[model samples]
Structure formats: C-alpha cells, structure tokens
Target: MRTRSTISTPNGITWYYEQEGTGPDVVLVPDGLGECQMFDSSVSQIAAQGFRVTTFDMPGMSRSAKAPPETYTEVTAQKLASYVISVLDALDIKHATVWGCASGASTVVALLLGYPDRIRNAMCHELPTKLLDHLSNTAVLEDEEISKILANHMLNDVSGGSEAWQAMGDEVHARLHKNYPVWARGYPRTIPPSAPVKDLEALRGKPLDWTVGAATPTESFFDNIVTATKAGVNIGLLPGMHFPYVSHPDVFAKYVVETTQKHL
Candidate 1:
C-alpha cells in the first residue's frame, strides 16, 4: 500500500512525501529536479522486497511549497540536513537506509555527516563531485548555463518523444528558470577535500555504496571511485545515464535491495 502526505517545517515550508510497504525503512531523495514520482516503480520494487520506502520532493519542487526568496536564499546543506531529520521525525522513522542520485546524493551525504546516527546505511548514484568543485568556485550561475545543463540530460532521448520526458523536462526547466537563485543558494559552494574523507571515516565501517553509470559524465567523479574506495566506500557500476533510477528502475531496485541485504 502507498500513502501520500505532507509535513510542514517550523519555517513554514511544506514538504510532500510518499510512503509504501512495511519493513525496514528506506528514504529516497530525488535529484535536483526533485520529483519523487520518478521513483514510483523503484519504490514499489523495493517495497515488495519487504522494505518500507519513503520518498519526497524537496522544498520548492513539484508538490512541495516554495519558500520566500529570502528564506530560500538561506537554504544550505545543513538546513536540508535538518529537513531530512524532520521528515523522519514526522513519519516516525527513527533510522533508515538513505539513498540518493546526482545532487540528491550530495544531500544524502549531508544527512549522513550532519545526523550520522539517524542513517542506518547510505547509497548514492552518479554523484557529481566535480560539480561540487565547480559550485565551490562559483556561488551563482547564469540562467543560460542552467538551461544548457538541463537540456543536455535529454540529448540522447531514449523515450522516443514520450510525454513523460516532455513533462519532466518542462517541470525541470520551470524550476531552474523560476528558482535558479534559490537552487544555487542551497548547493554547497566549496566542499572541503576532507569533507567526504572525514564523513566516510566517521561511518566507522558502516555501509557506504557509491554507484556510477556508464553513461554518466566522464568528468563527474570518475576518479573519485578510486578515492572513495581508498576511503572505504563500495562502488557499484550500472549501464545507463545519470538518472538510472528513472531509466532502469528494475535493475536499480534489484541493485539497491541486494546492496541493502548485504550491508544490513
């Protein structure tokens, strides 16, 4: 069964979330586009494997309410870190295996670091480590650059002109154009070199899986796989684009469930 709900933060932002199945908890954070709907199939797959799956749209995305400009400007990984905790609290989830893809992976990292005790395990896919480096140097981005990046994701369209891609692209474009500044503010400007190293270390032998798809950008932390392994992170490889969860949910879900079973 699936239940849809919303939770309001103290600051007045309403976050939309969905819960399914019944077992060990797993929280799924969506990528920058922030539509949890993309994970519908994967969630069901995971749920069938005897896990409670939860996913949510970040503030200002899809069904979630946007914050005021000033409030949005103040968003940070730390704030989002707390937001994840609040969602857990509202849903009565004490600890969960947290998973994310792309920028969502960054947010999961923040949660793991900021509230380590609340996360039972961590799983990430196609994390753009280079993008973190780029964001660190530039606090803001031009609208054109954001648009170009968004368009690039749809370049090798496998959907054959499906309405799904068109609708998702439209939402993604609207979010970037209407809330570019807020989105920029939420991203970390410059993650210290020791940040991941230290966080991984703190895991103290906890399970940390990092996956990269063959179609992911070559520059998006290709070598970080080596660095992550050195820091005790397990690496999983897939054969698809950056958004494998959307493009290959069955394969992705199988990987996720298997990893969870192995690690847990």
Candidate 2:
C-alpha cells in the first residue's frame, strides 16, 4: 500500500513522496544519491508492522522537482537534516522515527541529536561508508555504462528475470543521469550517489564495470561522523553490500520495528 503523492517545496519544486499505513510517522530519508524507491520493499513492511512509513525522492532527483545549480551548494549534514524536519513540518508530523539510508546515515544522526524535539529516533540503514577519494577518481557514470548499472541493481540473480521490474530499474537509472547534471555538477561528488556493481557474467550484457565514475567520493567525506546521538541508535549487520533493506526487506523491517519500538 505504498501510495505515491506530491508536495510543493518552498523553492516551488514538486516533491514526490509515498506512504502507507497510519500511526506515528516514520520518515524514510534516502541517501544522498538515492531516490525514495530504494525503500520500495521496506516501506510496506514497516507500515504493516505498526508505524506509518513515508519516503520521498529528494529534489533534483528522479520524479521530484529539479532545482537549479545554485540551489545545490553550501549544504551541510546539518542543513540536510533540517530539510528532513521541514518535510515533517510540512506534513504536520510532530516528531517521527527516521531511517536514513546509506550515506544519509549522517543526516539521521544529525536529526536525532540536532532536533531532538522533532525526531523520536533514527536508523542507519548502514552507516555512510564514504569511499576513499584517492582510489575513486572516475568522474561520472557514462551513458554507455547504464545498462550494466541497471543490471547490477537487479536482484542478485533471478534465474529468469522479470521484464517489468527490469524496466523500472532502467527508468530509475536513466532518470538518475538525465536529471543528474545540475546536482551532479554542483554538489560535491564525494559523498556521491552509487548503485552496487555485480558479477560481470551474471547478465547476458557486456562485462560489468565497477568504476565509481561521477559518483566518486573524497577521502575527507568520511569525516562526517555521529556523536552525542541518542534519540537512540541501532547498529546491526544485514546481508547485502549497501542495501540489505532493498534486497532483504523482511529482515530489515524486523530490526526496524524492534528498534522503533525500543525507543518508544
């Protein structure tokens, strides 16, 4: 029941958001380079567990409104977390349980500690493991590499793949690059967005390339860390590289529900 909807931002951008169920609000903030659909599986699982779950595609990404280049700079983890609060305020959500996926782990910690009054708790879908800048120098993921990128994002290996899901993955991947230039060029590419790469032979496609391209990170980006954080924190290992929640939502929802209730 994760239904999609839209809301206008103060900057006049239309933000796409999706939610399911009802109870206390649980906002799922996708990572710096991710769209709301990353939680496609986890959202419904959390909703049925107890809390209402809301996830949105950030501005300048996917179906969300695109902002000009100038709108992308001077951003900090602090301001990013504030934007989360702004979303909460706009939705009339008093305070909520927030799960900041991947790189957004920093933003969630900021919310738990910075706006203790607004966030009930936070989850690190996995901490922001920023890539070391030295080894990641590739620039941007080129258009030619898109096919492999989409295949990489597909479930580990379905003996026979589903065309519908494959098409959706293709759309998500293309929108990322097509709408990417503004934010891609403006925002620091360090804590940049990325999708997992896969076995080169898995698909009948060309050999897989794991190059970071435009999504490369600076060594210093890992400098963002969390401290004095206790709207409560939960840390655990999941089965996948960066997105176990996407690959294993059932388990993710189990821990999310447990952690969400523990804080209450």
- Local distance difference test values of all predictions, in order: 0.68, 0.55
Model 1: per-residue Cα lDDT at residue 172 = 53
Model 1's alpha-carbon lDDT is 0.68
Candidate of highest lDDT: 1
**Model 1 residue 13 distance off true place after TM-score fit, in angstroms:** 2.0
lDDT by residue for model 2 over 1-264, one digit each (tens)? 667888765754567889898888888887655477767877888888778988888766677755543334433455567666776777788978887754466567567656767877776544434543422322255634533443444434420223433434766766555444433333344333421111112211211111111111223222222211211222234444444455555776777777788767
Cα TM-score per model: 0.79, 0.69
Off by over 4 Å in 1: 68-75, 131-149, 152-200
Residue-level lDDT of model 1, residues 20-137, one tens digit each, is 9999998888765567877788899999999999998877766774544433444444555677788788788998888877666766777777777788778877665444544443
The count of backbone overlaps in candidate 2 is 4
Candidate 2 lDDT at 217 equals 29
**Highest TM-score scorer:** 1
Give model 2 RMSD, 1 decimal: 10.8
